[PDB]
A paper describes a structure:
Amblyomin-X is a Kunitz-type FXa inhibitor identified through the transcriptome analysis of the salivary gland from Amblyomma sculptum tick. This protein consists of two domains of equivalent size, triggers apoptosis in different tumor cell lines, and promotes regression of tumor growth, and reduction of metastasis. Amblyomin-X is a Kunitz-like FXa inhibitory protein of 106 amino acids and 7 cysteine residues. As a recombinant protein, Amblyomin-X inhibits Factor Xa (FXa) activity in vitro and presents the anticoagulant property in animal models.
The synthesis of two truncated (synthetic) regions of Amblyomin-X, one called the Kunitz domain which corresponds to fragments (1–57) of Amblyomin-X contains the first 6 cysteine residues, the other the C-ter domain which corresponds to fragment 58-106 in which cysteine 67 has been mutated to the Serine residue, as well as the associated peptides, were performed by solid-phase peptide synthesis (SPPS). The diffraction limit of 1.60 Å was recorded for the best data set collected. The X-ray analysis confirms that the first portion of Amblyomin-X (amino acids 1–58) possesses a typical Kunitz structure, with two α-helices and two β-sheets kept together with three disulfide bridges (Cys7-Cys58, Cys33-Cys54, Cys18-Cys41). The diversity between the two loops of these Kunitz domains could suggest a different interaction of Kunitz domain of Amblyomin-X with the FXa. This consideration is in agreement with the evidence that Kunitz domain of Amblyomin-X showed lower inhibitory activity against FXa than TFPI-K2. No microinjection cells were used as control. This result indicates that the Kunitz domain could be responsible for cytotoxicity and its internalization is crucial for this effect.
Residue numbers in the entry: 1 to 58
Write the structure that this text describes.
């Protein structure tokens, strides 16, 4: 595996039609950890629930 590689996965906000609560998450864009509205389902690993977790990995 390779946990650092998750840092270049594309931002994926998830499926709007799910019944999950939406939530702030963070993703790495190559120069910064950027906040986005995660739809609470789907997505990929470039998805952090704290800016600190994004910064400590990417």
């Amino acid at each position: 595996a390779n946990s650092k590689a998750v840092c270049n996965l594309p931002k994926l906000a998830g499926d709007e039609t799910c019944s999950n609560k939406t939530e702030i998450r963070w993703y790495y864009n190559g120069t910064a950890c950027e906040a986005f509205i995660f739809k609470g389902c789907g997505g990929n690993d470039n998805n952090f629930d704290r800016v600190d977790d994004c910064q400590r990995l990417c």
